[PDB]
Amino acid sequence: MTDMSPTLELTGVLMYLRAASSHSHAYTLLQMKSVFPALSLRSMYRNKGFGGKAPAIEWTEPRSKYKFRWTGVTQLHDGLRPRSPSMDVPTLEVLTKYELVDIGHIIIRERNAHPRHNHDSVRFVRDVMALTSGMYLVRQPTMSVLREYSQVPDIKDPIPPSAWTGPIGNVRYLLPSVQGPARHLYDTWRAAARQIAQDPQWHDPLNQAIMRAQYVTARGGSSASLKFALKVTGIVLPEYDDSKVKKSSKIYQAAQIARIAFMLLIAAIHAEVTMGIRNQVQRRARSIMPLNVIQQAISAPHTLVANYINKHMNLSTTSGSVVTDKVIPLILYASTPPNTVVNVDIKACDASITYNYFLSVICGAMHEGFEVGNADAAFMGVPSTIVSDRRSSVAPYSRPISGLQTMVQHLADLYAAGFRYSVSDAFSSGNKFSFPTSTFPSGSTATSTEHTANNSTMMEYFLNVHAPSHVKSASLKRILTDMTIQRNYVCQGDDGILLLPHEAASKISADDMNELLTCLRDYGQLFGWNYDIDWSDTAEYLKLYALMGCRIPNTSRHPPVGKEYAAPQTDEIWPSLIDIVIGHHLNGVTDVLNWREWLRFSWAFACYSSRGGYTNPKGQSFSAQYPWWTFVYLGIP
Amino acid sequence: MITIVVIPTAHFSWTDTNFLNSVDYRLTSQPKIRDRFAVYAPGWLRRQLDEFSASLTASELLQALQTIPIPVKARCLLLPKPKRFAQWLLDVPSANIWHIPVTTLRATVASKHPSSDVYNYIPDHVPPSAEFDTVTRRVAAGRDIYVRSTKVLGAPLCLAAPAKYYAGYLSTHQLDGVYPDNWAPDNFHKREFCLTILPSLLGPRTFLLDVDADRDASYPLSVLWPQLRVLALKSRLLLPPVALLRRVVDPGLKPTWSADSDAAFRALRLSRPSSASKPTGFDFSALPVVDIICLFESEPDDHGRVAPGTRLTIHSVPTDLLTSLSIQEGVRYPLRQESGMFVPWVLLALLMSDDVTISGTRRSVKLETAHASARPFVHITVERCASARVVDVRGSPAMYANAVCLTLPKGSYKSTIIDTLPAMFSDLSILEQAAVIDSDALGDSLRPSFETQFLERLENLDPKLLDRAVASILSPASDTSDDAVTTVLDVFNALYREVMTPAQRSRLPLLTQQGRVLAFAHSDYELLSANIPIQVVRGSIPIDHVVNLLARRNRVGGTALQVLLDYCYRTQASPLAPTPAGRLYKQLFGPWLMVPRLSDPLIKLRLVASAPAKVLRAAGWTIDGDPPLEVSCLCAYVTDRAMAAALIERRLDSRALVNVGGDQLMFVEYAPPLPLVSIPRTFLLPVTYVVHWVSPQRVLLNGGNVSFTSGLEWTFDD
Amino acid sequence: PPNRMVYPWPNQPLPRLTVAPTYDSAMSNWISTTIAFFIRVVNSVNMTATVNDLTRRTMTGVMTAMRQVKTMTPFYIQHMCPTELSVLASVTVTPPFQV
Amino acid sequence: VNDLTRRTMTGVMTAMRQVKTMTPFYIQHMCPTELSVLASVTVTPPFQV
Amino acid sequence: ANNLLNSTIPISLRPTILCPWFASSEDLRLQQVMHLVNISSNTAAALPLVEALSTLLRSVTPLVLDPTVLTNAITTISESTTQTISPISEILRLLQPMGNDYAAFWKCIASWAYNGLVTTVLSEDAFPDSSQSITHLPSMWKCLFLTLAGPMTSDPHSPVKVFMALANLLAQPEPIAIGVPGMHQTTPASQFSHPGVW
Amino acid sequence: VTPIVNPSSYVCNVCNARFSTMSALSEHLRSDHRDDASTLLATPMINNAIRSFLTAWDGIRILSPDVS
Amino acid sequence: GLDVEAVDATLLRLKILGAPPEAFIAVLNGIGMSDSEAHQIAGRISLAN
Amino acid sequence: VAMLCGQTETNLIPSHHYGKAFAPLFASNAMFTRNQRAVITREAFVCARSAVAQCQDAGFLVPRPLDALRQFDVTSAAAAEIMHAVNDAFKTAFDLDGA
Amino acid sequence: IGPLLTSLHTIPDYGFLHPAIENDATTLRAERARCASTFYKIASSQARQ
Amino acid sequence: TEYLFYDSALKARVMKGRYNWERLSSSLSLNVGSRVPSLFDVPGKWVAA
Ligand SMILES: [Zn+2]
């Protein structure tokens, strides 16, 4: 379909054969995964005969709107050629381990035939990058959960215990005398909490309906834990089994809760949470950690503050997700010759956010930030309560606190206790168990808000404070200043993009870049964030790839044959295959393949799918098939 | 009839037979005393408050409630929907006491949209378009009220009509909730005093009871406490609990006209002569405790005179601890042991207490117990009991019968409570020392001990840097002193992460999967970093540990390594509000302390889990007899065989995942965790327990390791 | 000076009998003149050269409608709001602090 | 600089001006004594213009 | 209570009463100053005061805000449906009720009580862009709203900001003089926040 | 059983020195036991730091303007 | 649960059909919009914008 | 919108409505707490100033009966410690809560 | 995978897991039975992707 | 519905809107059976899902 030279296919065959020869075919492939993109995408135009035409893209003044304008083309020349070092040496060194140096030599030699940027060059890049294995790797869930959540961040300068005030029942406020990034983080969250505090947008009954309704979906989990915990506290929940609906559905548990006074349920938030696993194509499998409805309700302030931080600082860095295509022009602009871009992403944001360093600060800031407000004002059915204040050793006492603060009091307690998951993998045999971890749930988009907020905050402090105080190059200081996140940085969850101000008709010395990148790594190391940065004059953001303003579809991430299945059984009926075909065909259009040949293959797939049958558990069989005109209506020419 | 308004304290016992006891149990000591009090505080009102709590501000709620008379004579009479309700006036024509026209009634029966006309013009009808205060205003009139909603406040809510009209209009649990109100009333009596949870206008005949403790955070009316207290304060209306015992009420301590020297005042004389053959042969969830004021004195001068001394307040020490030790008021006991340490019983009192403060003010102090202070105390005298009340213990600090880990700073006196206390009895099974886990165990497990390895790495640094670090840690004003301390911290963190974590993770079943484990740790991080499913309680003791460990000289380190480790652990510990460790101790040992006070013998129990012989033989085990083997998971104690048997028919919804190796190391795991509150409060559990075969002679040879699953069933034993 | 408060608008003592919308308050006067001015702006030559008169006719219409709404706020500001402030000044935990 | 920033900057500067510090006193009345004695014992005598 | 809730006492002997409930103004003045010393002089100090007072105001008030009559009086205006722009829609797109029941109005009122501590200013975003012309209808409507809402704020610079807001739109046909150098008629109006730049 | 009579004398663990008053014993532990330069870090200076900390302890003051 | 794309389609369809304003009011009130905001929203509906 | 959409009930008497609304506010002594706290504030303030001055040499304008007694250190640190001592003393004696 | 296979009655050439192995892993919780079962399950699952 | 309609104002709004709608749609004779998005059907959608 991609119409590549047989030589490249030859390399891929040797690639697979070498992997298959050794033990653990999956593991062997996984180790040498990034070899192809590094050999081709990361190093293309590091030579002399450089040139061609490139897009001229302009970013409009209200950069928050993410509006871009195509405004002509730019001639390419040697002064514009990429500055970063190539990737040949590390890749070849790795390939020597598996005695596949021939593959590198073949690829490099073939690559050297494209000194100038044009259709042929990018087409070559597309084809070679399409060689990575497209298999959905799967491993035992028990090993997966044991290997991922067994990590704890390493903080290089922990907050000393003497940096906190007296307790407020559960939380501690941060002493004013403390400075550094933690102080920056504390102030930011506190300021946002203040803005949330007084806001008649809530207590609007319609808005309250939105939040409660947002918590219910067809899927769900942890229902068994819910029923146990409430039955434990003497709460007799209703049941509706005759209404044939799954108990574990978040809908089912929500219906049981409807009548109960909310405060009675408070003891149930400290309950077990089930888990699930979704496999991936080029990485470890993802995790799905659905909280119960009550826990999801309690964590509301955390989400609300995070949303305000996002929507009112860097405009959520596209996390509004209105149409995903807004990132397309962004990376195209970011990859143009006049601009220098750096790809960054937290190594494991889910595993690095934790209570001992991060969440404690946030909880304290939020609890303090909510002090501005009526101490007696119930929120979402959570009434105000009396808590003991022990900030003054000479004059301790107790005072009321608003419902928001009560939520924080419990929320901090839960975070400090750590999440308690229960694994029940079906592929393994009779081995269910439970173990706690500090790993944040991060099962869906609801987590992107918190991580994006913290991501932006730390980056901003690094740019404006830490880096100028610590870097050496005067030229770097000159260019590092006059730079701010709202027009130089975007992110979503762990992923992030940093782009430098246009160096005047020139490019920054790689020496300064190395100095800059090194300091950033150390800065992340301070509070236990492995930044995993790279600089190759390309654009990786939300799994999209751009080179010199041209988008590169990474076809390997959409294997023609591969499809994820997270259960031992496919558990589906024949007609569903049609929708699979339709979705399959569209990818071959989204990714630009040979449109004539792709269409031919698609129809063949449709023909096989057009027919099917079924048999009763004991009785009759049934059969049917569609006339081919159906697929025309479904969208196949 | 003087009224005393009462706001419950932090762990107020509610299911108690008498609300009165949780206030101050001394009031129950004498018949001549207990006959002077009424209580009121009805349950129906309690439930209403539980609901409305989430919908009214404190000021509004106080403003609404304050006008209600003591015995609520009114009722809320719910009306059924008009189509249903209209039929009632014709099912009994005389019930049409408003005489709504028959034509209108059957017009309503005919209409697709029966209007509110049947409600219209009915006197004192409360539509859903009404507010809380509307009800309360009518409550002061004493007459019953007719309402169109269940969410009402101030009076018991009962159906106006038979249930047939409300059925379909309402559902089962809703139709159930009104049953006590359907026959609500009970009389209220004119004794000298009447306590009440209902607020009221503070005045010459109404008083606010002051207990000097934090409110019940869960109790919905605790938010009123500040406003009530300040109003009472500005008019001198607070009553200390002791005032209630006097023949005539007055706010004050040490009055002229009374010496307050009587058996009624002495809370240490807890007595239980009466009986009723009730199922609670004992309620081991209810624990009586006391707040006491104790005077401390140093050695006399060269002429036999002595300094004025100082008096401190100890909070919520369990009373049975003192009684069982024959402690008596007004006796100057010796405080110091032969080696200068505290006498054991004092240490127990401190450990199980909640807090220690200066008697007058409200400043909490951490007491020293070493040779640090000059003119140190040598004598102690308990002077009076500021308060004496029963408190609920069930599942308060800890939640699961499986295990619990308590974190304490290094240098605590955990050894005393775990050894001396059971040794002081050594006649009734309290615990098994093989089940308690010393916090130092894993550090001792490494072939070179974790301390030795840390020392060996540490000495590589320059001595001056180490010296600077130690001095900085001791000197409180030495803020940060980054260089010296941070370097040491890096070594500590690097080593601990490197060696301790895998070693800890390798002991997972030992910590949790035994019968019942009590464990100690230096920081919650020690467990969280290893993913050990055990509840962790961040405790604290009201004694200075730093000085305490400074007296322990026989260690690997010369008292300097100890303080270094102490600081490292404290730095490693997560920032959170820690709780008093005494509460956990009260939950564990408290019930046992009440054993000697009992009059009748105990009865043993257990919840053995079966084991099919097939898997045992299949695993190479040699076993006699076909019947499935069974293993005791946890033993319990009761004293009323009747109710105990009556409660034994419940089928616990918690399976057991039994695992045992060939070396007979046996382990248990409950797939649904077993919560303590699920245990009926008449039971009694040992602090720790070890799972074991009920009949070891059944087996004849241990084959390979074995695992299996089975249900759980409480059963007697002989 | 003690027991006195300043007020950005003119004020009056509390009315005696029932209230009603009025049109001589300071705020009402400010509203009317403001609307009158903008209407004059819309009819200025600058708009005529570019704005179709039909739309211009509409715009002056809607502005006219706003000027004729019998709102209660201007009366409330001049006569009733000061009383509410004067009372509440004795209730808030922090007394008023003005310049 | 809007008004809010203008006051904010002003508050910072005046705060810096108001805080007590003994450094100026040490310079004017104590530091010369320390320099005088130290110069008498250091192996390299002071070199001044 | 401004002589509302008039009440009186009985006339009989009250022998031994004592109600120590009062103090001089100097005491109150001293306490007020002390209270102002124990706060962070940023917005964190002011916000609870304004919020509390605003809540009290909204708690007790006979006034009810209801835009139904205004919209009803606006939507009844007849216009051709064959045009490409309907200014009615432009208006109604503005005046969007954010559902907060107009917290700004009560917020402005409360701010007056503490004008000596905190000042309310018009938000910068709620300005017409200086690049626009008077014929750009949304800009014109914005300027109208600023003019109407001007007096309700406590900012001393609000009148100038209002005046410059229109001056920006008329920089092309109607020029005027700006005193301080470095400022032009197209400067964003929100920047005129200094008495010397009038 | 709980003691009811104060000790006639007080004993240190290793020095075998008996004291008529616990205060005298306290001083002996406070001073004489604490030089012991025998380990990898038992330096005299830290002994002074410990000694100073011991003497400076007071945790039962009503007023504490130093820490306030 | 409800679909915005269904809501606006119905509203525009009503507007093209020339339904009386109360029809819009009922539809808007059917999804929780209060009468005042319902009128405010209903007025915005136009074929031009 | 607020100033253009204000309305009230038709037959409204302000006096009755305000009176009925303000009744619950002035119902207790709570409206007088600030007076008492202010009084204590004054006495605490004066005593603190007096104490700090007496330890100094001829500070402010206070009488100095104890001047015969020696007081060598007069540094600001000593003054701060004295002021804290007085502040703690008053808070203890009268059981104050806030700053 | 071979040694862990029986034969199917429908297609005799291909096979599936021994019923004995899964039974023992289920009932007896036998180690080698469980290990074989787990290996068979995941190996099959990987092919199913 | 109870979980959805925690308060009463929303329920009153939706009920009024639905009642007016069907009354208008039939009387004005636009049509009958128009499945208009409304909150009363949101629980129905949840149940079906
Ligand atoms: Zn000795």
UniProtKB/Swiss-Prot annotation, chain F:
Subcellular location: Virion
ZnF locations on chain (C2H2-type): 10-33
Organism superkingdom: Viruses
Role summary: Inner capsid protein that self-assembles to form an icosahedral capsid with a T=2 symmetry, which consists of 120 copies of VP2, with channels at each of its five-fold vertices. This capsid constitutes the innermost concentric layer of the viral mature particle.
Family listed: Belongs to the turreted BTV-fold inner capsid family.
Binding partners and assembly: Homodecamer; each decamer is made up of two conformers of VP2, called VP2A and VP2B. 12 homodecamers assemble to form an icosahedral capsid. Interacts with VP6.
Protein name as annotated: Inner capsid protein VP3
Species for this entry: Aquareovirus C (isolate Golden shiner/USA/GSRV/1977) (AQRV-C)
Source taxonomy: Viruses, Riboviria, Orthornavirae, Duplornaviricota, Resentoviricetes
Gene that produces this protein: S3
UniProtKB/Swiss-Prot annotation, chain G:
Similarity-based family: Belongs to the reoviridae RNA-directed RNA polymerase family.
Source organism of the structure: Aquareovirus C (isolate Golden shiner/USA/GSRV/1977) (AQRV-C)
Organism superkingdom: Viruses
Protein name (database record): RNA-directed RNA polymerase VP2
Reported function: RNA-directed RNA polymerase that is involved in transcription and genome replication. Following infection, it catalyzes the synthesis of fully conservative plus strands. After core assembly, which consists in recruitment of one capped plus-strand for each genomic segments and polymerase complexes, the polymerase switches mode and catalyzes the synthesis of complementary minus-strands.
Gene, per the UniProt record: S2
Localization annotation: Virion
Curated annotation (Swiss-Prot), chain H:
Coverage span on the entire protein: 820 to 918 of 1214
Subcellular locations according to the entry: Virion
Known partners and oligomeric status: Homodecamer; each decamer is made up of two conformers of VP2, called VP2A and VP2B. 12 homodecamers assemble to form an icosahedral capsid. Interacts with VP6.
Residues forming coiled coils: none
Main function: Inner capsid protein that self-assembles to form an icosahedral capsid with a T=2 symmetry, which consists of 120 copies of VP2, with channels at each of its five-fold vertices. This capsid constitutes the innermost concentric layer of the viral mature particle.
Name of the protein described by the UniProt record: Inner capsid protein VP3
Family per similarity comment: Belongs to the turreted BTV-fold inner capsid family.
Swiss-Prot record, chain J:
Subcellular location: Virion
Protein purpose: RNA-directed RNA polymerase that is involved in transcription and genome replication. Following infection, it catalyzes the synthesis of fully conservative plus strands. After core assembly, which consists in recruitment of one capped plus-strand for each genomic segments and polymerase complexes, the polymerase switches mode and catalyzes the synthesis of complementary minus-strands.
Entry similarity comment: Belongs to the reoviridae RNA-directed RNA polymerase family.
Protein name as catalogued: RNA-directed RNA polymerase VP2
Full-sequence range covered: 982 to 1030 of 1274
